[PDB]
């Protein structure tokens, strides 16, 4: 209902301002804290079909371009496996009780 | 056409002769570019069958 | 004809590749068809060694071990 | 002769005088849009027309009407430059007056109230640049002209392939500009059928019934009448004597006591003549002849009131009896002949399932919208709404015109809808074609091919916006309260604005201008496309439409078309071509009246040109211009042959008009095979500009036109003397004759300086004029990129030798001397725009601050306190342009990392480094930085520095304006005051500000003083308002996307020179890729000791037949000869006489050319400069097909001191020994296309990966791996290599496990693979199993 | 998964699945509320439609995705894929450890190698480089190794020279047709961004030099190295699999070289003299005393292996030219002098390699071919062959042929004017005379150009 309420104002104010109300303009018109315009206006958007075609009409579709950011680079994982050998080596360099206490 | 190209490339070709050569050119490019696709399709069918 | 002969293939995974996928999958799914691989296309699809060339040694060694003691 | 022509003149071979000179090349683009947005006080196309169409909008019966008054386009929010920098669209607000009237309920019509809402705003429509371009987002964009099937009626064949019985078929098609298609077609049974759009087939007559025609009137329409009389008793007949043609006597034909024809004797022209001259109106026929004859109208029994026979029924000997005894004297029958007049419609009725109008309407409505129950009002509404509604249907003007014309009508203009007469006429014509009289048209003809352009299309999209606003207005006017709402609350902004924005922003015809090159620009702006909306597709249409047609002559260039997926679906516009009044393509011609060739020009369209006989561009006439030979090669109707002396109606205007600006720029084109010429004109558009714009040494004479007409250069608005010349600006003092009385004046040209182009090349203007120089109106003030002194230089000509050099030239390969890379001539300047975005995450806002986790002092050095790189700082790959950091909290580390941090006491930051760094390997100098900020967020340090700087620069510039202007005006006041009251020394003493008080004796000069006063003060305040406006435009926070707080754009200028791997080509379609860059030491040299720049492989010359590239070489050498000689005589400093002599000698050249020449030119100051400009080489113009000849070239070589062969002795720079045989050396113009090798080059080891299916994907512009396809797989399969293939499709790509497990082994020194299963197939399993299909992996 | 600007993007299946859920749940509700039949039926049909749309869309109504006209992609469309019949193995797959670029010549190369841009080889072999850097202990850890090669420290180039040596790379061109479309080469580190490709191989790839690009792939696993070297290697395919004829046949410049080399003019320096052997024949030529082509008798020693696995030798005075004499130095062992004594056209120069292969075996044929290429390029370069505008000779009799043939057409035309011949027969006649004329001019210019 809030979103709709914003739309209503944006309609008159579209030609009334001759350009369009500033992003903070509809904010004063509305009751609440008014910085909420950004959040509400953003979250209100509908997700884009991951099958949305881009370029060439070719089978390249939007979803094909979305990379995995949750993965871990091999150039790193190698250094994890290496760091194991590192700290494991250096933990053989102290007394067994210092080693036990540090590994603990 | 019953009036061939009487000139050649060492000499100049006039407007008409060149305009008439153009069709042969475009049909050449089109035909070859198509025969590439035909060849490919054929190899496809072939490796599929073997 | 070649395009006709390519139609019949024991392996359904192979057929699903170059033929009409939907029909092949259904028509195989009813008979409970069991794909044994044994071919190139299917092995490429499933991502293991090609039953030819360098790989021919492997598959052979596997093919004879199969249906045997 | 002009002023920059005195600087340099191009020696022009060729004979044919130019009767007409090349027009404005940008014509189409500007004219179209000029028509779109404009005020036209009538229905002629424009915003006015599109308004008058959908308007006025009345509600549904409610008598609340909204009409349209007038519209206006407000001044642009930002001008072109600012709009380019900021990134917004160059557009004007559309303000339209609407009038809302409310009629008193239960009228005579009168209004309760009418509110006129002043100019409600709908949308902002984009504006076209003076150069015919649009700026959508900060980017110059061109909308390609479209080529489609012209609206009207069209008759086709479809012989052959259908049914394989031959017999052809005949179909007509009515194609409206808007609305449904109406198709008519025959079938193998000769039954006429009709289909609306592509829909279900219906028997033709079923439409006629819907027009309210009973069967009797259909027969009455399509067939003639055979009259039968029963007079006395037993069967007479009316006979039109022509009816007996093509038929054999079925009985004794006798009348008037004289027997004209016996039984079994076919009736020929003799019998017919006899009957005609003996005038036999009525003859006696047997009762059995009507056994086949079909009755025309209905027949009833007068007494019993019962139907004897229905209309269109076959009579029998018994039926005749039953209608005879009823007292019927007359029987009307159809006139039917299986040869001449066909019995088609009659048999069409027998396949017609319907009876009356309502029946037909039912079968039509159920055809268009099937499955749903039909209604009377529904069928009527639909059928009336299809072709008969002013709303849903238009052929417009072109449509109505072609329609009426093709129907052999008189009226060239008429209603925009269909009439019963129209449909009936079309059917009649189709039947006439099936009957043998008349022919079918063809689609490829350019009379059936219509040309749209930006304006028309934009009009269409705006129209669509207006219909979707119409629905809204009616929807609101449904429930409305009287005086509260007004024409604002209804009409929205977004719908129209998004219609137009969706057009210019994304459309197959809307594309980024290709600006790497003036030729590229100008050849893009003239372009045609049969693709896009309302056009065909590559997949759809075959070779017929792609192919060159005889009608393409002089209209579309035969040799310039793309070579690829779409060939001939584009082409290009010809040189002299123009859009026809109706929108067709017409070409210039010379009218030959009687036996004289008149120089009067005449423009002929595709259909206009058809019947006339047209002469050749190449022909021999003399004196009065009478044809020398008794017969000359000409083309009349669709073909070319020898034609008699005086037959010819017309003649070609130019030797050029067949080709296009691109093809017209190829010298010695006549000597090149069409394929290679095509490729040549195709690649010439790809030439990247060079650092020093050179000039073509070998040329055409079009280059001047291409240079000037394209906006790359800066042309004088008015003539005068240059007051000031700077690398920044140029100020010209206007002559009084060209000058307006008020404001006095000077014309100030602000030059474009180094800035980003669309292709990321450098676009920069340089002044070609010097301080205090005379300039003429229409003269080049400053050259753009790749233009020299008003001509077009797309590259640099150079010394070339044809000979194999150690295989380094092997295929097309090019071998280039080090002298070239050292001279920095083929060097190129690239301008790249890199961006940095500061977004908003739930974790926090991103900072542009210079405080960056994990960077050395060397890293943070090149950045200021604010985090942005300094202007002018040279950077390379990895350098930080803009420091940026985004919050990521709580890293969540592991045990050994925790121990590590414990020992080394490091605080692992809550912030991650997002900073924009120069992409790998690219290196250049920073020429600019821009900072966009959300309106309301505090501008940072650097951005503020920038704002103050820009402010001061603005004030300085505006002040300069006002100063030069004011001085210019007061200098005029000083001059006018001196007439009638001259005081010379007295006037300039007192302060200049106090001058305006002093008057003058009675005269118009007092009123001139008045004028200068008014305009003075006008400028004075205009400065003020302009300054205020500029300041506000600087300070306003630009509106950005959601989530982005601020954006920093850095502009890098990289200078790349030339390296092996770069693509190079001549204008002749000869490609090459530089192989080795060889030392000047190893270069083949001549006896004089002068090395050669490039060594071309001769083997490339014979096979691909382009012989022009050789001629171009030869003449080129010759040209250089004329240069060298002069270079010596200038270095001799002989005197003006010797130089003048030699130059004139050059400019004459032995006989019969059209050039003329000097000594009208000032013998000292002007001549020496010309000689100075010629010393590099002597520029030559070879007209396209009018170009030079071997003899002329050899003669110029005689003047050169150089051999006739064009070949000399060359010595290997290595052994110093000679080369057997002479080798061809000369000067070839060579282009650097931008394929440049450090763009194309890519490599990847282990990069990012796609989420949906785990596969290699570039996310960093760190490129995704190469795609290994099916064919490559087969290639691996032919070899015995299993492991290469497995590793190819498993570990190197698709295996999320195997890839890393591989990497660790690759570093460990163990080469193996533990493959696992590719994730693609593993996903496919889930996809299959997601259905009701169980797919399992068995056994072990 | 989320995007930039806080926007979201998702597969269409959700839109589909969601529907199937909703309606399904609604149906359950309509059961517990005891709805009339007409309602629950409609709900059942709707559920059927939703499920159908989910599984395979387009077999009933073709439902459209939210706010977007384009029909939403269903599971059957997920399986089928597109570009005709391609299942993501079939169309292609992105692959790590690979690259590509514009290609250039590199005639200096042996047939078994290829020029590889330094930077490309650096980025390609990166993991190998990392492992080798800390194998010798030049880098403390893998991280430090990365920092080293990323800094491009001078020491890494030599390590790259190590990891490159015995380690073949696969080269591929765009239109792969037969198996020769991919071939293995030994990498040669080369400054510059272009790939260098041996000329003799340019035939197999159908690769011009006009800007065609080639792709490189690294054979990671040991088995891939040995597969590449023993199968996909350049030297291991010298023959087309289609027919036993050599695909390594010299292309253009080289054959013009050998052609210009062994050929003879009528009179030239050194004509008629005699020399001890090919050595002093070349010595005669380079010093400028004797012409490259002149009729000369020289003593040669040829070989025939015609004994049993054994090379016979025989010496004689052969009547040959200077060029053929010089060229003979290259021809290995058991080949007869008869093979080089001819004019050496593109056809004969192929049968040379062929006979060499069917006689001496693989290795000699390889090295022979290489030598033939080198000498071809060299001597062709020496020859100073070129093309001028006067190199193309038009017959002197052309205009006359044109004129007579032009008389013929006006003759047949005059016959058509008088009705002596029908239109079609006329057409055929005129066309025949013009064709014949063309043949005449062709066989004029052929004689003049050829023997004059
Ligand atoms: O004599 N024939 C022709 N002469 C001819 C010459 C110039 C322009 C137009 C026609 C001819 C007739 C049809 C089609 C073609 C074309 F397009 F292929 F060049 C050429
Ligand atoms: Mg090529």
CB D1272 within 8 A of CB E98: no
Contacts of residue D1254, defined as CB under 8 A and 6 or more positions apart, other chains included, come to A68, A71, D1294, D1296, D1319
Q: What topology does CATH give the domain D151-223+342-442? A: 3.90.1110
For chain A positions 16-45, those within 8 Å of chain E (CB to CB) are 42, 45
The neighbour count for residue D651, using CB atoms within 10 Å, is 23
Q: Is D1106 exposed, middle or buried (0-12, 13-18, 19+ CB in 10 A)?
A: buried
The whole-angstrom separation of Cα D226 and Cα D238 is 7
How many residues appear in chain D?
1340
Pocket test for ligand 1, best of D553, D554, D639 (most atoms within 8 A of CB): D639
Positions of E strands within E289-348 = 295-304, 312-321
Q: Which residues contact D28 (CB under 8 A, 6 or more apart)?
A: D145, D453, D525, D526, D573, D579
Is B3 part of the contact surface with chain D (CB cutoff 8 Å)? Answer: yes
> φ, ψ for residue D333 (rounded to 5)?
-125, 165
CA–CA separation, D199 and E211 (whole Å): 49
Distance CA E172, CA E164 (A): 19
Q: How do the domains of chain D map onto residue ranges? A: 24-150+443-573, 151-223+342-442, 224-341, 574-654, 655-711+787-826+1057-1240, 712-786, 827-937+1038-1056, 938-1037, 1255-1340
Q: Residue D1309, Cβ neighbours under 10 Å: how many?
A: 10
Determine the Cα–Cα distance for residues E393 and E396; give it in Å rounded to an integer.
Answer: 9
Q: How big is the CA angle at D705 (ends D703 and D709), to the nearest 5 degrees?
A: 125
Q: In angstroms, rounded to a whole number, what is the distance separating the alpha carbons of residues D901 and D656? A: 79
- Check if the beta carbon of residue D209 is closer than 8 Å to that of residue D222: no
- Who among E7, E72, E82 is closest to A48 (CB)? E7
Is 6.10.140.1670 the CATH classification of the domain at D938-1037?
yes
Q: Residue E215: which H helix or E strand, with range?
A: strand E213-217
Contact list in C for residue E56 (CB cut-off 8 A) is 22
Query: What is the number of residues in chain B?
Result: 50
Query: From the CA of E143, how many Å to the nearest CA of chain A?
Result: 6
Question: What three-state secondary structure class fits D789?
Answer: coil
Residue E390 annotated as lining a ligand binding site:
no
Measured distance CA(D143)–CA(D511) in Å, rounded: 6
Nearest Cα of chain E lies from the Cα of A92 at a distance, in angstroms, of 18
- Assess contact for D846 and D839: CB atoms under 8 A: yes
Q: What is the length of chain C?
A: 69
Q: Which of D1120, D227, D1183, D1194 is nearest to D697 (CA)?
A: D1120
- Which is nearest to E322 in space by CA: E372, E269, E287, E281? E281
Other chains touching E, judged by 3 or more CB pairs under 8 Å: A, B, C, D
Q: How many CA atoms lie within 13 A of D920 on its CB side?
A: 14
CA-closest candidate to residue E184, choices D1281, D1266, D1243: D1281
Query: Residue-wise over D1155-1183: b if at least 16 C-beta within 10 A, else e?
Result: eeebeebeeeeebbebbebbbbbbbbbbb
Q: Where are the beta strands (DSSP E) in D654-765?
A: 698-699, 714-715, 720-725, 729-734, 747-750, 755-756, 762-763
Question: β-pairing, D111-126 with D134-135?
Answer: unpaired
Q: Tell me the C-alpha to C-alpha distance, in Å, between residue D51 and each of D48, D57, D68.
A: 5, 10, 7
Asked if D589 contacts D652 with a C-beta cutoff of 8 angstroms, the reply is yes
User: Best mutation site among B40, B43, B47, B48 for testing chain C: the one with the most C CBs within 10 Å?
Assistant: B48
> What is the Cβ-side half-sphere exposure of residue D282, based on CA atoms within 13 angstroms?
6
Which residues is E64 bridged to in the sheet? Answer: E71
Q: Where are the domains of chain C?
A: 2-68
Handedness of CA D1212, D1216, D1221, D1224 (dihedral sign): positive
- At CA D484, angle to CA D479 and CA D486, rounded to 5? 85
D574-654: CATH class = mainly beta
Using a CB-CB cut-off of 8 Å, the residues of chain C touching E85 are 17-21
Rounded distance from Cα D1061 to ligand 2 centre (Å): 14
Is residue D806 packed enough to be buried (19+ CB in 10 Å), middle (13-18) or exposed (0-12)? buried
CB B31 within 8 A of CB B39: no
Q: How many whole angstroms separate alpha carbon E245 and alpha carbon A45?
A: 67
How far does the CA of residue B34 sit from the closest CA of chain D (Å)? 10
Residues 6+ apart with CB under 8 A from D447: D150, D551, D584, D605, D606, D607, D610
The answer to whether E197 touches E114, Cβ cutoff 8 Å, is yes
Phi–psi pair at D299, nearest 5 degrees: -135, 125
Protein fold of D655-711+787-826+1057-1240: 2.40.270
Specify the CATH number for A1-72; select among 1.10.3720.10, 3.30.2350.10, 3.30.1330.80, 1.10.10.10: 1.10.10.10
Q: Give the C-alpha separation, D1024 to D1035, whole Å.
A: 17
E380: burial class by Cβ within 10 Å (0-12, 13-18, 19+)?
Answer: buried
* Resolution to one decimal, Å: 3.7
End-to-end CA gap in chain C: 41
What count of other Cβ atoms lies within 10 Å of the Cβ of residue D798?
Answer: 23
C chain contacts of residue D1321, beta-carbon cutoff 8 Å: 45-47
Handedness of CA D519, D521, D527, D531 (dihedral sign): positive
Three-class HEC string of D140-191: EEEECEEEEECCEEEEECCCCCCCCCCCCCCEEEEECCECCCEEEECCCCCC
Alpha carbon distance D434, D436 (integer Å): 5
For chain D, the straight-line distance linking the first and the last C-alpha, in angstroms and rounded, comes to 92
Q: Is the CB of B20 under 6 A from ligand 1?
A: yes
| Residue E389 burial class via C-beta count within 10 angstroms: exposed 0-12, middle 13-18, buried 19 and up | buried
**Distance of CA D602 to CAs D396, D599, D608, D658, E22, Å?**
27, 9, 11, 16, 72
CATH architecture under which domain C2-68 falls:
Orthogonal Bundle (1.10)
E12 marked as binding residue: no
Q: What is the DSSP code string of D322-371?
A: HHHTTT--EEEEE---SSSS--HHHHHHHT----SHHHHHHHHHHHHSTT
Q: Which two tokens stand for residue D91?
A: 């557009």
D488 contacts A16? CB cut-off 8 A: yes
Residue D514 contacts residue D685 (beta carbons within 8 Å):
yes
Q: Is the peptide bond before D56 cis (omega within 30 degrees of 0)?
A: yes
Distance between CA atoms of residues D359 and D347, nearest Å = 19
Domain D712-786 carries which CATH code? 2.40.50.100
**Structural contact between residues D635 and D644, judged by C-beta atoms closer than 8 angstroms:** no
Cα-based distances in Å from D558 to D566, D650, D682? 15, 22, 13
Cβ–Cβ contacts within 10 Å for residue A62, how many? Answer: 15
* E319 annotated ligand-binding residue: no
Q: Which residues pair with D450 in a beta bridge?
A: D148
Residue E120's SS3 state is helix
Neighbours of chain A (3+ CB pairs under 8 A): D, E
Element (H, E) at D1114: helix D1108-1131
Top CATH class, D827-937+1038-1056: mainly beta
Q: For residues D748 and D736, give the distance between their C-alpha atoms in angstroms, rounded to a whole number.
A: 16
In the numeric block, which tokens belong to residue D299? 């027949």
- Do chains A and D have 3 or more beta-carbon pairs under 8 angstroms? yes
Rounded to an integer, what distance in angstroms lies between the CA atom of residue E183 and that of residue D1006? 91
Contact (Cβ atoms closer than 8 angstroms) between residue D720 and residue D775:
yes
Cα–Cα separations (whole angstroms), residue D1130 to D799, D1148, D1179: 22, 21, 17
Instruction: Quote the CA–CA distance of D65 and D55 in Å, as a whole number.
Output: 10
Solved using: X-ray
3-class state of residue D998 by DSSP? coil
- Interface contact C3-B49, CB threshold 8 A: yes
Query: 10 Å Cβ neighbour count for E61?
Result: 11
Tokens of D747: 């014309």
Q: D712-786 with D827-937+1038-1056: one CATH topology? A: yes
Task: State the Cα–Cα distance between residues E264 and E343, nearest whole angstrom.
Answer: 8
Distance between CA atoms of D1090 and D1083, rounded to whole angstroms?
Answer: 9
């Amino acid at each position: 209902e809030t979103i709709n309420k914003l739309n209503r104002i944006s309609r008159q104010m579209l030609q009334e301002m001759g350009r369009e109300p500033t992003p903070e303009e509809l904010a004063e018109r509305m009751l609440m804290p008014e910085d909420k315009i950004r959040k509400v206006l953003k979250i209100a958007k509908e997700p884009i079909s991951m099958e949305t075609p881009i370029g060439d009409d070719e089978d390249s579709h939007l979803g094909d371009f979305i990379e995995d950011t949750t993965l871990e680079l091999p150039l790193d994982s190698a250094t994890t496996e290496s760091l194991r050998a590192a700290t494991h080596d250096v933990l053989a360099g102290l007394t067994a009780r210092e080693a036990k206490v540090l590994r603990m | 056409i019953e009036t061939p190209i009487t000139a050649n490339f060492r000499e100049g070709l006039n407007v008409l002769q060149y305009f008439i050569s153009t069709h042969g050119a475009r049909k050449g490019l089109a035909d070859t570019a198509l025969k590439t696709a035909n060849s490919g399709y054929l190899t496809r069918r072939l490796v599929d069958v073997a | 004809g070649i395009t006709k002969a390519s139609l019949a293939t024991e392996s359904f995974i192979s057929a699903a590749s170059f033929q009409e996928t939907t029909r092949v999958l259904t028509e195989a799914a009813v008979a409970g068809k069991r794909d044994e691989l044994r071919g190139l296309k299917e092995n490429v699809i499933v991502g293991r060694l090609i039953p030819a060339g360098t790989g021919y040694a492997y598959h052979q060694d596997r093919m004879r071990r199969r249906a045997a003691g | 002769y002009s002023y920059t022509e005195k600087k340099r003149i191009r020696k022009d071979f060729g004979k044919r005088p130019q009767v007409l000179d090349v027009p404005y090349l940008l014509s189409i683009q500007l004219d179209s849009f000029q028509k779109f947005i404009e005020q036209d006080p009538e229905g002629q196309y424009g915003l006015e027309a599109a308004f008058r169409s959908v308007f006025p909008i009345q509600s549904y019966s409610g008598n609340s009407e909204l009409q349209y008054v007038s519209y206006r386009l407000g001044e642009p929010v930002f001008d072109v430059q600012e709009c380019q920098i900021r990134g917004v669209t160059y557009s004007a607000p559309l303000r339209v007056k609407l009038r809302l009237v409310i009629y008193e309920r239960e009228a005579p019509e009168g209004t309760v109230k009418d509110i006129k809402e002043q100019e409600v705003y709908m949308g902002e429509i984009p504006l076209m640049t003076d150069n015919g371009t649009f700026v959508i987002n900060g980017t110059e964009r061109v909308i390609v002209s479209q080529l489609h099937r012209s609206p009207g009626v069209f008759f086709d064949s479809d012989k052959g392939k259908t049914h394989s019985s031959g017999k052809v078929l005949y179909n007509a098609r009515i194609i409206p500009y808007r609305g449904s298609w109406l198709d008519f077609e025959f079938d193998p049974k000769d039954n006429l059928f009709v289909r609306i759009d592509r829909r279900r087939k219906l028997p033709a007559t079923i439409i006629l019934r819907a027009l309210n025609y009973t069967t009797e009137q259909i027969l009455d329409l399509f067939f003639e009448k055979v009259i039968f009389e029963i007079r006395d008793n037993k069967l007479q007949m009316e006979l039109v004597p022509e009816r007996l043609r093509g038929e054999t006597a079925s009985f004794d034909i006798e009348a008037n006591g004289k027997v004209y024809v016996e039984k079994g004797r076919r009736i020929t022209a003799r019998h017919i003549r006899q009957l005609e001259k003996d005038d036999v109106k009525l003859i006696e026929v047997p009762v059995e002849y009507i056994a086949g004859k079909v009755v025309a109208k209905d027949y009833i029994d007068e007494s019993t009131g019962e139907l004897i026979c229905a209309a269109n029924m076959e009579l029998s000997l018994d039926l005749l009896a039953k209608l005879s005894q009823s007292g019927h004297k007359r029987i009307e029958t159809l006139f039917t002949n299986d040869l001449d007049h066909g019995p088609y419609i009659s048999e069409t009725l027998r396949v017609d399932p319907t009876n009356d109008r309502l029946s037909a309407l039912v079968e039509i409505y159920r055809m268009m919208r099937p499955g749903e129950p039909p209604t009377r009002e529904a069928a009527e509404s639909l059928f009336e709404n299809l072709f008969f509604s002013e709303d849903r249907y238009d052929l417009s003007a072109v449509g109505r015109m072609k329609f009426n014309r093709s129907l052999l009508r008189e009226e060239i203009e008429g209603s925009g809808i269909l009439s019963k007469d129209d449909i009936i006429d079309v059917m009649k014509k189709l039947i006439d074609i099936r009957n043998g009289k008349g022919e079918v048209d063809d689609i490829d003809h350019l009379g059936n091919r219509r040309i749209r352009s930006v304006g028309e299309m934009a009009e269409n999209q705006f129209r669509v916006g207006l219909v979707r606003v119409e629905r809204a207005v009616k929807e609101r006017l449904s429930l409305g309260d009287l005086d509260t709402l007004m024409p604002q609350d209804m009409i929205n902004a977004k719908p129209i604005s998004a219609a137009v924005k969706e057009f210019f922003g994304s459309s197959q015809l809307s594309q980024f201008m290709d600006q790497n090159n003036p030729l590229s620009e100008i050849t893009h702006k003239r372009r045609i496309s049969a693709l896009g909306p309302g056009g065909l597709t590559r997949e759809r249409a075959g070779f017929e439409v792609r192919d060159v047609h005889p009608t393409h002559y002089g209209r579309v260039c035969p040799i310039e078309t793309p070579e690829g997926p779409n060939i001939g679906l584009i082409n290009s516009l010809s040189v002299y071509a123009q859009t026809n009044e109706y929108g067709f393509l017409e070409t210039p011609y010379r009218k030959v009246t009687d036996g004289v060739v008149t120089d009067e020009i005449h423009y002929l369209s595709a259909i206009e040109e058809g019947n006339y006989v047209i002469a050749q561009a190449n022909s021999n006439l003399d004196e009065e211009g009478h044809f020398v030979e008794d017969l000359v090669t000409c083309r009349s109707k669709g073909e070319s042959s020898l034609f008699s002396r005086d037959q010819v109606d017309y003649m070609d205007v130019s030797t050029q008009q067949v080709v296009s600006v691109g093809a017209s720029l190829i010298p010695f084109l006549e000597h090149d095979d069409a394929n290679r010429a095509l490729m040549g004109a195709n690649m010439q558009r790809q030439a990247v500009p060079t650092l020093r714009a050179d000039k073509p040494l070998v040329g055409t004479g079009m280059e001047r036109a291409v240079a000037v007409d394209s906006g790359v250069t800066a042309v004088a608005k008015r003539g005068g003397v240059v007051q000031y010349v700077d690398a920044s600006r140029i100020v010209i003092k206007v002559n009084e004759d060209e000058m307006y009385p008020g404001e006095a004046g000077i014309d100030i040209y602000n030059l474009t300086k180094y800035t980003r182009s669309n292709q990321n090349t450098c676009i920069n203007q340089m002044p070609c004029v010097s301080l205090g120089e005379p300039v003429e109106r229409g003269d080049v003030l400053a050259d753009g990129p790749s233009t020299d002194l008003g001509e077009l230089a797309l590259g640099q000509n150079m010394r070339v030798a044809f000979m194999p050099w150690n295989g380094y030239n092997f295929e097309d390969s090019i071998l280039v001397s080090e002298r070239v890379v050292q001279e920095d001539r083929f060097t190129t300047i690239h301008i790249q725009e890199l961006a940095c975005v500061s977004r908003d995450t739930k974790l926090g806002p991103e900072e542009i601050t210079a405080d960056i986790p994990n960077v050395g002092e060397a890293a943070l050095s090149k950045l200021d306190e604010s985090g942005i790189v300094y202007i002018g700082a040279e950077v390379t790959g990895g350098d930080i342009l803009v420091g940026k950091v985004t919050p990521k909290g709580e890293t969540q580390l592991t045990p050994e990392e925790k121990l590590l941090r414990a020992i080394f006491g490091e605080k692992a930051s809550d912030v991650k480094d997002s900073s924009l760094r120069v992409p790998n390997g690219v290196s250049g100098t920073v020429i600019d930085v821009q900072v966009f900020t959300r309106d309301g967020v505090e501008k940072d340090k650097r951005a503020l520095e920038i704002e103050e700087m820009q402010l001061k620069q603005a004030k300085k510039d505006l002040s300069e304006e006002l100063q030069i202007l004011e001085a210019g005006l007061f200098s005029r006041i000083r001059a006018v005051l001196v007439a009638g009251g001259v005081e010379a020394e007295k006037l300039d003493k007192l302060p200049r500000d106090r001058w305006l008080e002093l008057g003058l004796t009675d005269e118009e000069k007092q009123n001139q003083l008045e004028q200068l006063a008014e305009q003075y003060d006008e400028l004075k305040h205009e400065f003020e308002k302009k300054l205020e406006a500029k300041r506000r435009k600087i300070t306003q926070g630009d509106d950005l996307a959601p989530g982005v707080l601020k954006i920093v754009k850095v502009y890098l200028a990289v200078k790349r020179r030339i390296q092996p791997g770069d693509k190079m080509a001549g204008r002749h379609g000869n490609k090459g890729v530089i192989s080795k860059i060889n030392p000047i030491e190893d270069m083949p040299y001549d006896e004089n000791g002068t090395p050669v720049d490039i060594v071309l492989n001769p083997l490339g010359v014979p096979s691909r037949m382009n012989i022009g590239q050789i001629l171009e070489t030869h003449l080129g050498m010759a040209a250089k000869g004329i240069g060298d000689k002069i270079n010596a005589m200038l270095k001799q400093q002989q005197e003006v006489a010797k130089l003048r002599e030699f130059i004139q000698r050059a400019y004459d050249l032995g006989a019969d050319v059209r050039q003329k020449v000097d000594l009208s030119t000032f013998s000292d100051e002007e001549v020496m400069r010309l000689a100075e400009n010629l010393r590099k080489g002597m520029p030559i113009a070879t007209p396209v097909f009018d170009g030079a000849k071997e003899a002329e070239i050899k003669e110029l070589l005689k003047l050169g001191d150089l051999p006739t062969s064009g070949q000399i002795r060359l010595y290997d720079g290595r052994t110093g020994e000679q080369f057997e045989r002479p080798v061809t050396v000369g000067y070839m113009y060579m282009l650097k296309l931008n394929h440049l090798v450090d763009d194309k080059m890519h490599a990847r080891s282990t990069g990012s990966y796609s989420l949906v299916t785990q596969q290699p994907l570039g996310g960093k512009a760190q490129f995704g791996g190469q795609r290994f396809g099916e064919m490559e797989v087969w290639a691996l399969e032919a070899y015995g290599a299993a492991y290469t293939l497995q590793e190819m499709l498993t570990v190197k790509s698709d295996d999320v496990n195997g890839r890393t497990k591989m990497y660790k082994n690759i570093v460990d020194g163990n080469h193996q693979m533990e493959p696992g299963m590719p994730e693609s197939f593993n996903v496919l399993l889930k996809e299959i199993r997601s259905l009701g299909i169980n797919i399992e992996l068995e056994d072990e | 998964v989320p995007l930039d600007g806080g926007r979201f993007a998702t597969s269409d299946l959700n839109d589909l699945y969601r529907r199937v859920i909703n309606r399904n749940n609604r149906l359950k509700r309509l059961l517990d509320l005891a709805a009339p039949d007409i309602i629950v039926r409609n709900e059942k049909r709707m559920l059927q439609e939703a499920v159908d749309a989910l599984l395979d869309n387009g077999r009933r109504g073709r439902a459209i995705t939210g706010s977007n006209k384009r029909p939403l992609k269903s599971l059957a469309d997920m399986i089928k894929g597109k570009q005709g019949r391609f299942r993501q193995n079939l169309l292609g797959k992105r692959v790590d450890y690979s690259g590509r670029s514009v290609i250039t010549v590199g005639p200096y190369l042996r047939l078994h190698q290829c020029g590889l841009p330094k930077k490309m080889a650096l980025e390609l072999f990166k993991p190998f480089i990392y492992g080798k850097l800390e194998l010798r202990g030049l880098a403390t850890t893998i991280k430090a190794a990365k920092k080293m090669v990323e800094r491009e420290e001078a020491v890494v180039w030599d390590i790259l020279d190590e990891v490159i040596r015995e380690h073949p790379v696969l080269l591929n061109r765009a239109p792969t047709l037969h198996r020769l479309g991919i071939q293995a080469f030994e990498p040669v580190l080369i400054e510059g961004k272009a790939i260098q490709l041996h000329p003799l191989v340019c035939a197999a790839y159908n690769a011009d030099f006009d800007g065609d690009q080639m792709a490189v792939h690294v054979p990671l696993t040991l088995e891939a190295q040995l597969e590449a070297r023993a199968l996909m290697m350049s030297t291991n395919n010298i023959l087309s699999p289609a027919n036993g004829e050599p695909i390594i046949v010299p292309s253009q410049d080289v054959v013009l070289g050998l052609y210009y080399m062994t050929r003879d003019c009528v009179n030239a320096k050194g004509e008629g003299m005699v020399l001890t052997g090919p050595k002093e024949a070349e010595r005669l030529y380079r010093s400028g005393l004797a012409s490259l082509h002149a009729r000369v008798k020289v003593r040669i020693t040829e070989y025939e292996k015609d004994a049993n696995g054994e090379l016979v030798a025989k010496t004689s005075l052969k009547d040959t030219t200077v060029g053929r004499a010089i060229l003979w130095m290259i021809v290995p062992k058991g080949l007869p002098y008869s093979i080089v004594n001819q004019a050496l056209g593109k056809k004969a120069i192929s049968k040379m390699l062929n006979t060499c292969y069917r006689i001496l075996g693989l290795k000699p044929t390889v090295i022979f071919a290489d030598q033939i290429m080198y000498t071809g390029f060299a001597y062709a370069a020496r020859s100073g062959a070129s093309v001028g505008i006067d190199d193309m000779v038009i017959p002197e009799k052309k205009h006359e042929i044109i004129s007579e043939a032009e008389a013929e057409v006006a003759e047949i035309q005059e016959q058509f004017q008088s009705g002596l011949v029908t239109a079609g027969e006329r057409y055929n006649k005129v066309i025949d005379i013009w064709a014949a004329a063309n043949d005449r001019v062709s066989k004029a210019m052929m004689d003049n150009l050829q023997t004059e």
